[PDB]
Amino acid sequence: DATRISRSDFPADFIMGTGSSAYQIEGGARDGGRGPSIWDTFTHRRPDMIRGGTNGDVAVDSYHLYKEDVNILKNLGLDAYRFSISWSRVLPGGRLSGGVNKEGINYYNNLIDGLLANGIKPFVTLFHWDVPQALEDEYGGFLSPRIVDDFCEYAELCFWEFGDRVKHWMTLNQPWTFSVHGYATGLYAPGRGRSTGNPGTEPYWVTHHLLLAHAAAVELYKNKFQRGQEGQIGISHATQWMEPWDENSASDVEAAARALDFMLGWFMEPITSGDYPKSMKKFVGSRLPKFSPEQSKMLKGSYDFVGLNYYTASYVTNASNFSYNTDIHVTYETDRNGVPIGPQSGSDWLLIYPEGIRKILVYTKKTYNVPLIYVTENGVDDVKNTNLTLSEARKDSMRLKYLQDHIFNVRQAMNDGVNVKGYFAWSLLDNFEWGEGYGVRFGIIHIDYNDNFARYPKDSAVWLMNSFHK
Numbered sequence: 001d002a003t004r005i006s007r008s009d010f011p012a013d014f015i016m017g018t019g020s021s022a023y024q025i026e027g028g029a030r031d032g033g034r035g036p037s038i039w040d041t042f043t044h045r046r047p048d049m050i051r052g053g054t055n056g057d058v059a060v061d062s063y064h065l066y067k068e069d070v071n072i073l074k075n076l077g078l079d080a081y082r083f084s085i086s087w088s089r090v091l092p093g094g095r096l097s098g099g100v101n102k103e104g105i106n107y108y109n110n111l112i113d114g115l116l117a118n119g120i121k122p123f124v125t126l127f128h129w130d131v132p133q134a135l136e137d138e139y140g141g142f143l144s145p146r147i148v149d150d151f152c153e154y155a156e157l158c159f160w161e162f163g164d165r166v167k168h169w170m171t172l173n174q175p176w177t178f179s180v181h182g183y184a185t186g187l188y189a190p191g192r193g194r195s196t197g198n199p200g201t202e203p204y205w206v207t208h209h210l211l212l213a214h215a216a217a218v219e220l221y222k223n224k225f226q227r228g229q230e231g232q233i234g235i236s237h238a239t240q241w242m243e244p245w246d247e248n249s250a251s252d253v254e255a256a257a258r259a260l261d262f263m264l265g266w267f268m269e270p271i272t273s274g275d276y277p278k279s280m281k282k283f284v285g286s287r288l289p290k291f292s293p294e295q296s297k298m299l300k301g302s303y304d305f306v307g308l309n310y311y312t313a314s315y316v317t318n319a320s321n322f323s324y325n326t327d328i329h330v331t332y333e334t335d336r337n338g339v340p341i342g343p344q345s346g347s348d349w350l351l352i353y354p355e356g357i358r359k360i361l362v363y364t365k366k367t368y369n370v371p372l373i374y375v376t377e378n379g380v381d382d383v384k385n386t387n388l389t390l391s392e393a394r395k396d397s398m399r400l401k402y403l404q405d406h407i408f409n410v411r412q413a414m415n416d417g418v419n420v421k422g423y424f425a426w427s428l429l430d431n432f433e434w435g436e437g438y439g440v441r442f443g444i445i446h447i448d449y450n451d452n453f454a455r456y457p458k459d460s461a462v463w464l465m466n467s468f469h470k
């Protein structure tokens with residue numbers, strides 16, 4: 001029974017936590033010496049692409065209110081906090097020659113020491129989509145292999161400044177989403193793919209450079225820092241459970257494995273065997289870049305742990321100029337005979353399917369033999385409703401059930417043999433949700449946008465504190 005799940009159902013070294021990313025919570029977008037990221041430019045030049053026309057200039061002001069966030073985290077009682085560094089805050093011009101911003105280094109040091117003073121372990125992600133505009137404008141950012149060397153200079157600065165206290169690093173978070181919505185759909189920054197963009201080629205280049213940036217930073221960590229600092233490094237991937245529309249149709253079973261291949265396998269195979277998956281080579285063909293053997297040798301095994309982010313699931317079937325989307329040759333279905341795979345959250349794409357996380361975890365251990373996994377993101381958004389007062393708004397029983405069910409399933413997956421070392425809910429605070437602006441709330445902590453981003457715990461935060469304190 002999922003309602004009685006609690007810390008005592010887990011081993012002693014199991015880590016519970018919560019998460020954010022820099023651009024979604026910080027604001028201070030032009031404070032403290034920070035330069036612009038591609039998100040700054042996208043939300044300012046193209047406000048029509050954002051619900052409400054809003055941006056993250058102020059967001060929820062964790063740049064100034066970080067002492068409050070630390071205080072909330074202390075009261076919450078969980079082991080860990082996962083956040084990311086804004087690249088253009090510490091390197092406003094992206095590369096070392098653009099100046100090193102000491103004030104942005106001071107921010108991250110104050111945040112890290114306040115977390116440590118309170119017994120909270122920092123898990124830090126280097127990159128969460130906020131490419132410095134200078135690097136975008138100079139040579140097209142992740143479209144160019146120049147990005148690998150710049151990204152390494154940046155990773156080295158972080159290890160040097162923070163590596164004495166941060167022992168858990170992630171190079172990238174959800175690079176899938178960056179690649180696809182940035183370059184295939186054009187819904188996210190830099191907003192291309194519908195030169196002006198090409199959804200047939202650009203996503204594949206971007207992903208290819210993301211993986212090389214990741215591998216070069218891991219080798220840098222491993223050869224130059226790991227012995228003096230004794231930390232660990234990994235990466236976090238987007239996942240969505242892919243279920244055969246018809247359990248029996250072997251054509252359907254194959255469409256599902258291919259959907260997995262194009263989402264997860266696209267990233268996971270290169271760091272496992274040095275190459276892209278077979279299905280992708282077959283359906284993408286000559287548009288899919290190749291690794292030199294030095295690159296392959298660098299990629300293979302380039303991690304100490306992997307993190308997975310899981311929200312939802314879907315049914316897959318077979319499909320009947322070029323585009324990443326059409327290359328998959330699958331169609332997505334939500335119902336089996338008028339019965340949805342699960343109920344909607346406040347977002348129509350997000351269907352609640354807890355068994356999804358147990359399956360995605362077992363699949364990953366099986367298909368890739370990952371020794372050590374964390375669930376680095378999992379969570380759900382409130383029904384949109386500006387008519388509720390805070391007493392009502394904070395009663396977030398859907399989220400509370402969602403968390404219980406998934407955490408339960410995570411337990412199950414460990415009984416199935418998956419070695420899962422921790423779980424981070426997503427996210428700590430209501431914050432800026434990219435295309436969806438401020439309208440979609442994912443936080444265990446409520447934010448009052450009418451009154452200086454005043455923070456208040458929802459029921460789920462109370463529950464997490466009570467069942468998982470330590």
Ligand SMILES: OC[C@H]1O[C@@H](O)[C@H](O)[C@@H](O)[C@@H]1O
Pocket residue numbers: 021024174309377427433434436440442
């Ligand atoms: O808005 C949906 C997205 O929101 C962000 O908060 C997270 O970074 C993503 O993982 C999530 O898919």
